[PDB]
Design a protein around this ligand. Structure first.
Ligand SMILES: [Mn+2]
Ligand SMILES: [Mn+2]
Lengths: 248, 248
């Protein structure tokens, strides 16, 4: 219900087309088709900046995030390029809502360029709806775990709650859910900052540095333990996990 | 004879070390260890700019040249980093001579990072002292043909005059020698702008778009025809060629 879904489809079309024109999905190739001045400067904590036409990217953030920022700005330009899509958006949204839709479309396009549906479907085929597949997508696409989490969950055909867990400053430091996403049908969500029990398979994966795949529970902050099969892949001081909700 | 040779060795050492620290030789990885603001802006025809600490690269030049420019600035910083090398240079050269030595060392270091000796020796082993090996080095290293030409010629153990030929504005357009280099012992050089005869194998390669390997002559502007075996590889509207001078 809404003009966002058809707009997202058009964004993916434009993004996929620009990608095929690119020699590769390498950061340099993306910069090549930017068609605008791009400046990488240190600037505390921020994904990046847009262009009127000068694009800016923080050099303190990890390269993966800079890649997504660049794809976002490419998608923004691609959007402002197609007059039809822009007219459709302006004939449907206005003010903050239009800005939110544009931002969402830019993020939708960025993922379409960096993470192709083929790659995701192939990885889901080889590794299944698992945290290992999440790790593969993030590495094979050189993207942040959070970005891959949303893309992988969107194309999962089974009830799965993917999650990216890592050590956090909490309130001193502990393993917390950094990001979470559910497959199209999942009716649950994992609060960011949720603490991972030390006895939990995800924590064992971080300590052992070995992939852990066992039946466990979703570590809800309510002390509730929803039965689920957990596939945890440890990587870069972060644990990519898959919570397969089981009917029980 | 001179302090340049030992300086070049130290430059290669520092450059090789920084390269091994890099995750890969991808343009992004090189930018990661720049440790300085980098800005890509259109600016007519120019390889790039140095930093006091902001590096600048022309966006109108091909990506391969931008890669070499980035490696050059990394080598320059690497040079200014090692106090010993800089002291040695200042204890040996001064004024314009020092600037020339620094520039040469920066170019020596840039090639060391982008084109490893292993890669060159491997390609020379599989394809031999040929224009095909020149094409492979330029592609496998994502570097300009001119840069690869000098690196390949430096490690060729046989008398070979490598050359990069392409269509030029001449004085209207014709196939001309864009760049040339000889193996360590070659006692000849090919003038840039030398015209390639239409009957010459190099020209046939450009028209046929097929690799040509036959016995021919070095097309000297003096009408002189020095006997040589010619291996011409056509690629990207440019012909990478190898002139194997034969004793005869
Ligand atoms: Mn934007
Ligand atoms: Mn310099």
């Amino acid at each position: 219900t809404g003009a966002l879904a058809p707009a997202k489809a058009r964004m993916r079309e434009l993004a996929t087309a620009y990608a095929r024109r690119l020699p590769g999905l390498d950061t340099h190739s993306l910069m090549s088709g930017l068609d605008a001045t791009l400046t990488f400067m240190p600037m505390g904590d921020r994904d990046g900046a847009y262009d009127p036409r000068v694009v800016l990217i923080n050099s303190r953030v990890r390269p993966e995030r800079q890649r997504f920022t660049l794809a976002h700005e490419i998608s923004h330009a691609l959007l402002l390029g197609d007059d039809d899509l822009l007219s459709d958006l302006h004939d449907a949204y206005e003010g903050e809502r239009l800005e939110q839709v544009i931002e969402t479309l830019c993020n939708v396009g960025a993922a379409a360029i960096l993470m192709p549906e083929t790659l995701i479907d192939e990885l889901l085929a080889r590794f299944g709806p698992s945290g290992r597949a999440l790790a593969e997508l993030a590495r094979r696409a050189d993207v942040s775990a959070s970005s891959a989490l949303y893309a992988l969950a969107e194309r999962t055909s089974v009830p799965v709650l993917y999650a990216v867990c890592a050590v956090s400053r909490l309130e001193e430091k502990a393993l917390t859910v950094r990001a979470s996403a559910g497959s199209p049908g999942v009716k649950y969500s994992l609060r960011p900052g949720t603490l991972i029990p030390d006895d939990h398979p995800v924590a064992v994966a971080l300590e052992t540095r070995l992939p852990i795949t066992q039946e466990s529970y979703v570590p809800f902050r309510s002390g509730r333990r929803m039965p689920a099969y957990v596939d945890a892949f440890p990587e870069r001081q972060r644990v990519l996990v898959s919570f397969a909700l089981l009917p029980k």
